[PDB]
Every structure is written in structure tokens, then in C-alpha cells.
Amino acid sequence: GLDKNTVHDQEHIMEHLEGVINKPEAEMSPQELQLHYFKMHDYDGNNLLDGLELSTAITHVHKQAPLMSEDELINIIDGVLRDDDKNNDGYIDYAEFAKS
Amino acid sequence: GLDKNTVHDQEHIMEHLEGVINKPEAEMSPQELQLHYFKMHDYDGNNLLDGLELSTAITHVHKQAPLMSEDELINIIDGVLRDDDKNNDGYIDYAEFAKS
Amino acid sequence: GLDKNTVHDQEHIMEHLEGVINKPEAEMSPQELQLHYFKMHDYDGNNLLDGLELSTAITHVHKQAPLMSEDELINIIDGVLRDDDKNNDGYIDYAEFAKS
Amino acid sequence: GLDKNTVHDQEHIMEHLEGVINKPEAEMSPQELQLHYFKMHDYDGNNLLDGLELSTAITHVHKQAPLMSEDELINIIDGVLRDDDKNNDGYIDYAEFAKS
Amino acid sequence: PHRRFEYKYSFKGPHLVQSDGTVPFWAHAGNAIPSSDQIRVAPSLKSQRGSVWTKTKAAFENWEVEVTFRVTGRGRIGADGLAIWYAENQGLEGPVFGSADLWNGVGIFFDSFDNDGKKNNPAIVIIGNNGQIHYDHQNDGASQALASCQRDFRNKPYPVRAKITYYQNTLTVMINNGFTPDKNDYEFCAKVENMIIPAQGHFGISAATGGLADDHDVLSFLTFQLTEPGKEPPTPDKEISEKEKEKYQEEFEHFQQELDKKKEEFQKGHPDLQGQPAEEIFESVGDRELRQVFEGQNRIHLEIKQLNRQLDMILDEQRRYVSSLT
Amino acid sequence: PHRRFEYKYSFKGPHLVQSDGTVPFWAHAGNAIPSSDQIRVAPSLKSQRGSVWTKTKAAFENWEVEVTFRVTGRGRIGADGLAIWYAENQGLEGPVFGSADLWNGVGIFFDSFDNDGKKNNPAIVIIGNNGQIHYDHQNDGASQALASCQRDFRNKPYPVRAKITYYQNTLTVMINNGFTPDKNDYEFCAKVENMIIPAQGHFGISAATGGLADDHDVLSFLTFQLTEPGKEPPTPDKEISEKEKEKYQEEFEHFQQELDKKKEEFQKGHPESVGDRELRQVFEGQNRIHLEIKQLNRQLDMILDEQRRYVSS
Amino acid sequence: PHRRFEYKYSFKGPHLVQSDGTVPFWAHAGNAIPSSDQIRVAPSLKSQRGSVWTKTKAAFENWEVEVTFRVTGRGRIGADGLAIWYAENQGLEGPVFGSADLWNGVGIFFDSFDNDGKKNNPAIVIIGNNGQIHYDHQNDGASQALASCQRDFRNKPYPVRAKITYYQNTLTVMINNGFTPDKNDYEFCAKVENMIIPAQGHFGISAATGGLADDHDVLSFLTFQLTEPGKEPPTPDKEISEKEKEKYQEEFEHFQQELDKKKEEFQKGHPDLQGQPAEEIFESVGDRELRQVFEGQNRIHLEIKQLNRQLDMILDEQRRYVSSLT
Amino acid sequence: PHRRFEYKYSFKGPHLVQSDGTVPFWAHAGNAIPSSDQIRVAPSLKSQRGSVWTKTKAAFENWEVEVTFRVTGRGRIGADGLAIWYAENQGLEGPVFGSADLWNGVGIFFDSFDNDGKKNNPAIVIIGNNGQIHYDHQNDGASQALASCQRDFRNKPYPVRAKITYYQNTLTVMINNGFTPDKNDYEFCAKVENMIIPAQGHFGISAATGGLADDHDVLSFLTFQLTEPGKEPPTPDKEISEKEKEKYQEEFEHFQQELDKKKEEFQKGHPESVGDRELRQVFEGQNRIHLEIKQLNRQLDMILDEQRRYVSS
Ligand SMILES: [Ca+2]
Ligand SMILES: [Ca+2]
Ligand SMILES: [Ca+2]
Ligand SMILES: [Ca+2]
Ligand SMILES: [Ca+2]
Ligand SMILES: [Ca+2]
Ligand SMILES: [Ca+2]
Ligand SMILES: [Ca+2]
Ligand SMILES: [Ca+2]
Ligand SMILES: [Ca+2]
Ligand SMILES: [Ca+2]
Ligand SMILES: [Ca+2]
Ligand SMILES: [Ca+2]
Ligand SMILES: [Ca+2]
Ligand SMILES: [Ca+2]
Ligand SMILES: [Ca+2]
Ligand SMILES: [Zn+2]
Ligand SMILES: [Zn+2]
Ligand SMILES: [Zn+2]
Ligand SMILES: [Zn+2]
């Protein structure tokens, strides 16, 4: 549920940056790869992470385990939004993401 | 100004019925030719004589005299409408026409 | 399966005739109704009946019934083709159909 | 009337050049501006000047002046055609125009 | 509400123009061509501007205006277009749809060209102006629009009929698009609520044409004064008796049917009387283009026939020459 | 034949009408609407008549006129039609295609309405007249038709072009039907041999509209005086020196390309549609097929006549 | 008003479907084909019916719905069309635009076929129903229409974006017609004032296809809860300090520009990276027809070349035979 | 050759799919959408694969398949394309036009996307395979192309028709391009002589879509067994008497006209557009020009060879 080690994981960030950017980095600062983690899942381009993008951030298809059920996914996304989003906009900005 | 002899004139009715109906009548009752006079100038077909049709009834092109001025035509049409039209509709029905 | 009574069903030919033919029929000669059977089951317009058309003839739902297994319909259509089609064209002519 | 100064008017050729040519000109050789005069008064694109085109050249309003009587313009155009056109085609070539 | 027809603010055929050549009670200016059946406000020529305005001012608190018009063009794109006005002063000439700018009144603009580039034209735009605002013609009046409905009025089989009703400070425009010959087939286009217009003004029509050219024709203009049921005149007490009203109308209808029976057998009595259909009049632009292509193929067909005949002749003569030598 | 263009008896765009409002050298009458690009001789309104006639009379033994026009109407049926006259006097108004009857000269009538009912309209009818015969409106001039034709000039993608030539007492009418934008795409339509016309007359154009209404727009009307190659007197040394002409023309052809190169960058320095281009391509392909088939016809004629020479031997 | 995005009532690409093959929080039924970029509610086949409805009911007093969709067809006439619903119960299957009749809620119908014969289709019709009225599909809902705007949404170069706003009991539909790629180019289509809808209900999309066939695709559905400025939450007091807000965003933008500079020189570093334009995707029906005619003329051209070559050969051989004999 | 239609290995409308939801005798797999009038083998969505394969294997020494299909897309560029297979086993899913690679048999590929970049697409490529070679997707099968073609089957007014015939160990592919509604309007596209295929295999059709998306709809697929005129054994007296056939057929041809006369009044007793008819007329005129030019070609060939006989003498 948006765990610190999940965003701070290097291999996940490396797999997502594979192909799109052609410079593989052996090491990166946790803040740098958390900026990369925020940027990779913003598919629309509005620099805001809404519930639908976090749905593809939490559940995943990586090439296994059965896909997470609807109720658990709803609970995780609702918890993340209620904890990190304080402006009641329904989105999460980078300030909100970096705060928690 | 919608004189009784004007509608009751036989030659005017005969000239207007010439061509459109192929039965020339030597004599006709004044009521019959006044029905013909009401029917000939109703160009639209709504069985009502408005000001615009009376404009072509009063002023005319028959094959002369100079065409009647705008002010005199306005006065004649306004007088006819104010005298004969009592329902304030702006039109003259056959009952209104036959009354006066 | 190209049964005499199924071809001679007055009500079934009437059901096929409904809509396309406005006039209904009460009494009908056997040749009349078998020609209606041949024409209504001839969608391509080539005046010939093939296995794909006899399959629709035997296994169309109307208005229920278990859908026939493919093996049974294969046997029925093969029997019809072997018994009636001396042409060996793969098509049943109305001569070949009218023999049975 | 095909005067040397009228063809050599820098400001008139600049006025014709305005809009069609974005670049303005400050100094111009006589051949340069007489070629602009020949090209701007050639609407058909046949590279030839006829009386109908010289009429527009002499009697176009610009931005006043009394409109010339038809007899005067007939005399001017006939004089130009007789003096310059040795071709007798009814068309003035730029050889025939550049002679005067 | 109760309707009263006003002849002084109306014009219609088939006697639209007097012997002089001018519409009664209306003054025309610009490139308008008043005829005996319609007024061609802007003909299909480059840079045309026309207008027809009422002479006397109309003082109606509530009114209804029925304009029948046709806008025709050869291409798919059209000219600047048409405009119906209820102003304070006669615009006549000017740059706004063939009429002057800075008008104090209301203008319903049937705009056929897309100056803004929004790809939403032709359209009908209701714009109210007070005499200080300038109509932005390059923007199609999008910023100044009080109402906008996107109804294509160009190239229709039957004339387009617009009805513009000012009633209780509410202006409703309802348009019969001309797909059907029925006159009373109006469909809602737009409305503007709580609009203040000058108390008395001139009615008018204007039309303009840009680089592309359309024919803008007005067949009829009809004006009706509207009175509320509460604000009706006290009584039509002038009427004498209903008995004569029930004595005259059946005689009138008997005369009508007798005239019809008199007409029927003599319509066929004279063989010269005929009838011309109107099916040929309507054709779409793409339909005409395809028909033009089909007409163009006929030259190819005839040339192929000529080639075939020449080949036949050369074959026959080679045949007879071969037979003769052998 | 040698052709000399006459500006006095011609009119064309893109400046066709002066600031006064009249066509130079031409008098318009009736419902004609001269404009900057064309003359709408008869608009698409009921009972319209229009005519444009030359002011000064023309004294040509042989002449040639090229007229570009569009007859466009909403309906498939047409109006009364169009007329081109070489007459003695200015007809102006009248009942014969918007111009006067009893003309002394020749009239080429583009008739788009079938008054006779013979299903042979639109058509091009050449009618000569000496002033003592009435034109038959109801019979489409079939009785007095010196020559005839059958071409559809109504509602074409490109303007219809006509070349009418009087040469050696023979009148030839050639028509480009308006399926191609080529100006010199004329096809033979009609001819009359040994026709006498007045030696000095006016050139006129006219149009009329009946119950059905078409727009008859004339874009250009160019008149050329024709002279025979042997009858033309050559003046020695009248022409300029050839080398001077070569120098002039080479500098002119350099400078026109220089001007084009100047304009090319500036047009985009300070700033036809799909379907229209597709339709233009379709018509160009049709014209290409037509031209290729005509070339095949010419090759067939060549092999045929060479075979005739062989058969003779 | 203040907008809050609701993920449970929204769906969008490019990960629209999960690994299972179903849209999250939405149930699809009928002939709908959910993909990873869009949902083909009704494919271009005869007699197709599809619907996608929210699972959980939404309790919003004011809401905004942004639907991006494409309706494509081979011909000029189209299928039955699309419908956006805010109902009480999930319609799923049925005869009204691929959904059930007798709905208690509101339906915005993008109707592409002209059943009535009024020649006013395609159109957008706002209809509110309470569960007892039956939608007259043969009449295009003309009698039951609460709003109607005639905006052509078929065969557009860019996806059509409809915005449907319920606010203060007023329902406004504003449509970007898809002529421009700019998303925020909405233009007013219709409004309905003082309409009562059920307090909580399901959002849905449905599509249907008659004798003619169109492809109805929904690229994105976006739902926003609307709150009045007076009815806002008391304070966003949860926010700690503005200083960290002014410390984080410039670092974020620095990272964005550094990532762009990292991307730029290696986009050209790998030669296999390319780019495909979208100009070919858009073509009108008449344009395609004219292009088909132009393609058809090529057979005639090639056959003429063949005839010319054969004529050349016969001419040459007759020439050499004549020379040989003589 | 004598043709016997095989219903087991064929499918067509207007009742193509049963009430169960499957094509009779055919197994569909992938994103194929069988319908009443056609099978949409691959819809216009990103990364779609579909295939329809026969259930029972076919044992024909000579065979012939006629396939009617439409490949319609919004863009001018096309999807991965379509494939027709005579294989040993049902490929079903796979990466080669939506069907499995390493097939033992023959595949006719209608490829509408130019992966190689040689600007030679769309095209028809005949590829034989024995099961021990991978199909080259990126090179459009150019390396292993036994035969090739170049025809545009995308976005045509009428459905594209293909006849693929295996006769005397020769495979012939004839294509009607869809500019005419005539079924037997095939033109020669490709052929391969002396090709060996498995003596008993499945008939399949497949389609795939890449980044760009087209709809590949198959309206019909008719399979005929071919036999030689001499190899066919004639059975004496197997056919019915000819006079009985004549009596039957004359009463049938009377009664069909009787039924037509019955329907004609009742259709209007209880009750195509402009432009569509114009487009149909335009295409019919193009077909007429094409046929007339082909007739001229045949006449030229006739006069040419008769002249050859004359030259020999
Ligand atoms: Ca986002
Ligand atoms: Ca936020
Ligand atoms: Ca009346
Ligand atoms: Ca009255
Ligand atoms: Ca059959
Ligand atoms: Ca048989
Ligand atoms: Ca020139
Ligand atoms: Ca010269
Ligand atoms: Ca505009
Ligand atoms: Ca606009
Ligand atoms: Ca005539
Ligand atoms: Ca005639
Ligand atoms: Ca409908
Ligand atoms: Ca409708
Ligand atoms: Ca390929
Ligand atoms: Ca290739
Ligand atoms: Zn991941
Ligand atoms: Zn009178
Ligand atoms: Zn049945
Ligand atoms: Zn100047």
C-alpha cells in the first residue's frame, strides 16, 4: 500500500525506465527514484496521481500471483487518498506524494 | 376605396376570371361576383384578405394613370381595415367583407 | 431430414410466407408448397440447394428444441446428397429435390 | 499614356508591389521598375499587353480624378499600338514596350 | 397570445413589387434586386451587399416575424450570409452582413461562412447591441453571441422559414429547415430571456457576400403584433350578430366548391394547360459532382465506339485484300 | 490565318467594369449586371432579359470571337438561354433571347429549353436573318436553322468556351464543353458555308430566362480580326532587330524567375481543399483517358492509310 | 465550483482493462469489447447492443461527467448510436440504445439515425424519465425530449468530448466536436433547468446498432463531484506548511527538465525509434469515394497502355513486311 | 475441370452462425467475432488476432476456394493483414497473421503493412512451408516468397474476391479487386508450378492487427473439390430422364414468375438513394469502359494473328 520500500525499490524503477530512457543507472538517490516513480505512473501527463493511475501502480502485470481483488484495491486506494491528499481535489501532487 | 360599384363592376371581374376559368358569364348576381372578387385577390389561399392583398386590389397594373402614392394607399387600406375588420386579427373574412 | 410431411407442412410454409408475401394461403397443392419450400430455403438465388442451405433448413430455431449435434446433421445432409444428387455438383436441383 | 516618367515612377511601382511582394524597395534600376510595370499590368499571364490591359493601366483609380472619356483613351491606346506594335498581333511584347 | 397581421411592415408575392419597381413601405439599397416573387438581397457575385428596411418605425411591445428565405450556392462553402434586424435606425449599407455596425437593437445573423475557423458554420446567432459595441466579423460574433444554434440553412429543397418571436422580453427563434414543403413545421433553434430592445424601431433584412458567392433570396416577410390574453382589447362588441356569421360562411363554401366544379372539367378542356414538376430543382453538391463525372464518361464511350468501328473497317479491308491476293 | 486582337470590341477580367459602373466600349441594357470578374447577363429570376452590345461597329471581312460563359441553374431544365449576335444595329431589348427581333446578321443561339417538345435541347443553333423574318420562339428556330448542334452547356465543372469564326464566307462554331480547364480544347460543333452577313455590324451578347431560371454569366469575349497569309502586306524592316530581341527576352526571362524566387520565401514569411483536389484529379484522369484514346485513333488512322498505300502497290 | 475526481466511477487508458479482461469498478454486458485503450460498446456488425455500468451507486448532489468517444462509420448514415445514463438501476441489456427502458434517471442520447424522418439527425437529446414513461425510439424521443441540440458527432478527425454537468438542479451538456486536438475546446450544446434526478444512482454508457452499422468507442469516462463554494469543507487545515510546498515543486520541475535533457540525446541515439503521423487516419466519406474513383481509373489507364503497345507492334510488323515484299 | 461444392469445409450467409453462437463445421479462436452475415476475424482494435479453422481435415488431390472479404480501416496505412491457409494441423493462435507459425502446407498472405520498408505493400504473397522454417514478419516474407503480387484490397466500394486453386500441383491465385459487384470478375494475380502440399489438411483463415487497425471481415468461404474430366467416372443411367427434367423445369420457371407477379402488387399494397445511385452508375460506367477496351484488345489480337497467317503465306 504505497510502502516506502516499494517506491524506494531500485529494480522496479529500473524495469519501468527500461526502453523509455536509454541510460541505465546502477545507483540512484531515494528522492531521485521517487521522482522517477511519480513520473512513470502519470500516464495522462498532468503531473498528478489520481486513483486510476494508482490502480495500475498497485496492481500490476510484470513478466504469476493472482490479481488483487476489487475490495482490497478499493481499500488501499481509499487509504492512500485519505492519508496523502489534503486539498480534497482527488489527485496527489508531488508535494503530497513526498510528504508521505 | 373598396367602393360598392368597384366590386360590383362586371368588367373587372371578367378580366380577372379571364384565362383562369374558361367559362365567360355574360351576367352574374352582385353577391356571386362579390364572392369572385373576394376569391380572386386572395393570392395566398387562406380565404382572408389582409392589407397586402388589398394593396394589389386598390393599386393595379391593367393593360396609364400614375400609380397611387404611398400615403393615400396607406390611408385607404387603414380605413378599410378599421371599418370592416372587427376581430382585430388584421385580416378580413368573407363575413366582414359582405357586411360592408 | 427432407421428410415428405415436413416439406408438406402447410403451417410451416405459411410461417415462411408470412411477411414476404402479404397474401395468406388456405389450401395448397403439394407442388405449390414444395416449390415454396425450395424457394424460401434458396437465399443465394442460384436456384440450387447445397448442404449449407439444407443445414439451415433442418436446424433453424423458429419459435425450445435442443440444437442438433454436428455429426447428426452431417449424416442427414450426406444421406440427402447421396440419395438425391445424381449431378455430383454438390448442388441439389429441383429435379433432384422433386425426386424425393 | 505610356509616358517615361509614369513607367519610371518609383512610388507607383511600390504601390503596385505592396501586398504581393512583402519586401519593399528603395532604389531601382529603370529596367527593374519597367519590368515591374510590365508584370503588374499583365493579369492574363500571356506575357503580352493588349488594349484592354493598357486601358486599366491608364484609367485605374488608385486613391479624386475625373474618369477619362472613352474617346481619349481610344486615341491613347491606338497611338501606343501604332507606335510600338510592329507585330500587328494586337499584343504588345516587352520588346515592343521596351522600345518606348 | 393574440396575433394581428401588420401590412405596413410586411411584404410577399406574387405581387411583391409595384409598377415603379420598388417594394411598398420598404426601402431597398445596395445590390438588392426586388422582383415580383422574391428579393435577391445579395446576388451570386463577388463583393455584394444589399439591404431592405421598413420606412416607418414600428412600436410593438410584443411581435412575431416570419421570414421565408432561400440561400443557394454552387459549392459546399457559402458567402457571408443573411441578417434579420430590429434596430432603431435604418442600417442600409455597411460592413456587418451588408448593413452598418453600431446598431441599437437586435440582430439574428444567419452566418454561412466560418471566419473563426471553429468549423461550426453555417449557424444562427442572436446578438443584441446598444450602439457602442462593434460586431467582430472575423470571430463570427462568438464573444458577443447571446444565442447560437448550428442549423444548416444552405441548399435546401424547400425554402427555410424562420420565426422570431419577442414576447414578455423573451426572444425565441424557431426554424423550419426546408426539408418538407409543410410551412407549419417549425423546430426550436434558440431563445434569449430578459433582453431589452428599443421600444420602437425599424425591421430590416440584409445580406452580404465575400470571396465565395451565394444567392440570398427573401420570398416573404410577415410581421405580427402580439397581445397578451390579459392585455386584450375589452370586447369585439363591434360584431353585430352571430346569425349572419352562420349565414354567410356556408354560402362562401358553396361558392368555393361550385368554383372548383366549374374549374375541373375545363382544366382538361383546353389541351394547352400543362404542369411542371419541381423534382429537378433540388440537387446536392456532391450529387451534381457525381452526375458531372457520369456525363464526362460519355466522351470516352463515344471515342471507344469510334475506335471499334475503325478497327472493324481495317479488319474487313485487310480480310478482303488477303482474299483478293490469294 | 493571321489574328489581330481588337480591344475595342472585347471585354474580360479581372477588371471588367470601371469605377463608373459600365463596361468599357460596351453598352449593357436590360437586367444585365456587369461586375469585376464577369457579366451576369440574366440572373436566375423569373422573366429576366439582358444584353451587352458594342458601341462602335466593326468592319472586318473575316473575324473570330472566343466567348467564355457559365450557364448555371438549380434545376435540370434550363431557362430561355443565351445568344451571340453579329448584327447591323444594336438590338438591346427584345423578345429573342433578351434581344430585339428582325436582326440583319447572324445569331448563334444556345437554347436550353425545349419549347418544341422534340427532346433535342440544349442545343446550338446558327440562324442567319436579313430583317424580314420573325424568329420562331416556340419551335426553337428549327425551321430557319442554317446549322444545328446538340451539346449540354449547363452545370459544368469548368466554364464552357465557344469559338465562332467567320472566314471565307464560312461560319464555324467550335465548343469546349467545360470538362477541362484547357482554353484551346475546342471540338467541332457546327459550320455553315457560303453565308452572307453585313460588312459592318455590332457584336452583341444576350440572355433570357422564362419560367425556369438560370444564371448566364459571361467571363470574357475576345474578338480577333482575321487576315489571309497572302493578303497581309508585309512591311520590311518594320520589326526590331532580332539580336536586340534576343538580349531583351533573355534578360526578361531571367528577371521573371528572379521575381518568383523573391516571392517564394516571403509568401510564407508573412502568412483548394481535399475532395476538391480529388475531383480535379478525377477530371484530369478522364481527360488523360480521352487524350490517350484520341492518340490511339490517330495511330489507327496512320496504320490504315499506310496499308492503303501498300494495297495500291 | 470545486471539483473532486472520483476514481470508482471513472475509467481511462492506456491500462483500461486488468489482466482478467474486465474494466475495474465497471461491469460490461452485451456486445461490448473492452480493450486496453478504449471500449468498443457496439462494433460495426448488424444488431449489436452493448453497455458498461458502474458497480457501486454514486451519491453526489452535484457532479460532472467527461466522456471522450468516437463514432465511426463507412457510409454517410449511421447506426442507432450511443447513450450516457445516470439511472437508479443498471439497465444493462434492453431496446433503448442497447439498454433497458423504463429507467428512473437521466439519459443523454447521441442519436445517429433519423427514425422520425425529420432530417435533423445526428443529434444530442437530454431526456429525463421516472420509470413509467416509455422511450419512443421510432420518434427519436421528440415528444419526450427535455433538450435537443443538432451537433454532428460522426466521423471526426479527433475524438468527441462531451461534458455533462449537474449543478444546482441544472444539467448542461457542452460538446467539443473533435475538429481540433485541443481537449479544452468545449462549446455549449444544451441545458435543462430545474430537473429532479434520483439522489443516488449508477453511471453508465450504452450503444446500439440497427440495420446500418457504426463503431462506437469510449476512450475515457471521467467523473467529478462538484461542491459549491458556500458548501466547501471547513478548511484544508491538514496541510502543514507552505514552505515545504515552495521547496518541493522547483525540485520536481528540475527533475522534469533533467529527465527531458536525459531523453533528448538518446531519442536519436537509437536509430530504431521512429514516429508515425495521424494524417492518414481521417478521411471523409465523399473524399474516400472520389479517391476510389481515381483508383478505379488506373485499370483503364493500364489497358490503354497495353492497347497502344499492341498497336505499335502491329504497325512495326506491317511496316517490315511491306518493306520485305517491296 | 468438374467442381463439386463441399458444404463441410465452407461457410456463408445470410445465416452464418447458429443460435449456439458458433460457425457450423468451423472452430473460431482469438478475437474473431462470428456474426449472421460475416466473420469479423480481427476488429479495428490494437493487437487483435483471430482465426477460423475447419474441424475435419480435407482429402482432396485438387481443390479450389473462393473467399469474399473486406479489409476496411480509417487510415490509409493498414494493419498486419489477412491469411488463408491449407495446413496440416489447426494453427489457431500464433504470431503469423494471428495464426501459428511452423505450418506444414501453404499460406496466402494479404499483407497490408510494409514492415520491410520497400514501398511494395499491400501485396499477396504465397508461401509454402514444411514446418522447419520461421516466417519472417519484419521482411514481409520476401525471402521465402514462392510467388508475389501487388494489389490494393483495402477500402474498396465492393468486397474483394479471391479464387485460390490447387490443380495438377499448381496453385493459382486470381483476384477481383472489388471495383465491380460481379462475382466472376477474377484477374490473374499469381501462380506457382510444381508445389507439393500435404495430401490431407485443414482449411483456415486468419487475421491480425498491429499498431494501425483494420477490420478484416470474411463474408463467405466456398471450397470446391476439383476432378479432371477424364478421371471422373461416369455412371450410366444415374441421371434422371431428360423429358421429365424438361417438364419439371418448365413448370418451375412458370411458377417462379407467377410468384414474382404475386409479390409485385402486394409489396406496394402494404408499405438505394441519390448519390449512391450516382456512384453506382459511375462505377458501372468505369466497368463498361474497361470491358470495351478489353474487347478492343481482343480484336487487335485477332487482326494481328490473322495478319501472321497472311504473312506466313
Ligand atoms: Ca495523472
Ligand atoms: Ca491533491
Ligand atoms: Ca390572403
Ligand atoms: Ca378579420
Ligand atoms: Ca442456393
Ligand atoms: Ca445436382
Ligand atoms: Ca496580358
Ligand atoms: Ca506584337
Ligand atoms: Ca462568419
Ligand atoms: Ca464559426
Ligand atoms: Ca427553346
Ligand atoms: Ca427543341
Ligand atoms: Ca434515432
Ligand atoms: Ca430525428
Ligand atoms: Ca507486412
Ligand atoms: Ca514489403
Ligand atoms: Zn511495475
Ligand atoms: Zn384588376
Ligand atoms: Zn421454418
Ligand atoms: Zn497603379
Author numbering:
A (entry chain G), B (entry chain C), C (entry chain H), D (entry chain D): 40 to 102, 108 to 144
E (entry chain A), G (entry chain E): 42 to 367
F (entry chain B), H (entry chain F): 42 to 312, 324 to 365
Task: Give excerpts from the publication.
From the amino acid sequence, ERGIC-53 is predicted to be a single-pass transmembrane protein that consists of a luminal carbohydrate recognition domain (CRD), a long stalk domain, a transmembrane (TM) helix and a short cytoplasmic tail (CT). Here we present cryo-EM structures of full-length ERGIC-53 in complex with its functional partner MCFD2.
The present cryo-EM analysis reveals that the overall structure of the assembled head is composed of four ERGIC-53 protomers and four MCFD2 molecules, confirming that ERGIC-53 exists as the tetramer. The upper-CRD protomer vertically associates with the lower CRD protomer to form a dimer, and then the two dimers are further assembled to form the four-leaf clover-like tetramer. In the assembled head region, two different CRD-CRD interfaces are formed: a vertical interface (interface-V) between the vertically assembled CRDs (between protomers A and B and between protomers C and D) and the other interface (interface-H) between the horizontally assembled upper CRDs (between protomers A and C). Two different forms (A and B) of the head region are determined, in which the positions and orientations of the CRDs relative to the S-H2 are different. These results suggest that interface-V involves tight binding, whereas interface-H is variable.
